[PDB]
Design a protein around this nucleic acid. Structure first.
Ligand SMILES: [Zn+2]
Ligand SMILES: [Zn+2]
Length: 90
DNA sequence: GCTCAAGGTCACG
DNA sequence: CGTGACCTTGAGC
């Protein structure tokens, strides 16, 4: 069996594992753009923000913080960028 | 020689 | 212009 996998970033049903933890497609795409595009962000407020589906739209910075914290590793994103190279961390 | 998930690719709000 | 989400790639079992 497996649990109903959940994007533990924003708290919605994950499509599956993406970057070695359960994460939805939006979080995947963001996490890529941030790293691959070397995009800098800042919190509107204080970068002391809980992250939900709603709150992540507001705070890109806090989204990226949550992502790293829970276990979407920066190094998970290959700069080599080759599809299907599964990265369940071990 | 199938199965899982990196991750493009591009359509919608 | 930022997600949202669905097809393709292509590495592991
Ligand atoms: Zn998510
Ligand atoms: Zn914030």
């Amino acid at each position: 069996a497996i649990p109903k996998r959940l994007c533990l970033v924003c708290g919605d049903i994950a499509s599956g594992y993406h970057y070695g933890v359960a994460s939805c497609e939006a979080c995947k795409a963001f996490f890529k753009r941030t790293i691959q595009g070397n995009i800098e962000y800042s919190c509107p407020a204080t970068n002391e923000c809980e992250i939900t589906k709603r709150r992540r739209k507001s705070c890109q910075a806090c989204r990226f913080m949550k992502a790293l914290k829970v276990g979407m590793l920066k190094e998970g994103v290959r700069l080599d960028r080759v599809r299907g190279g599964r990265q369940k961390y071990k």
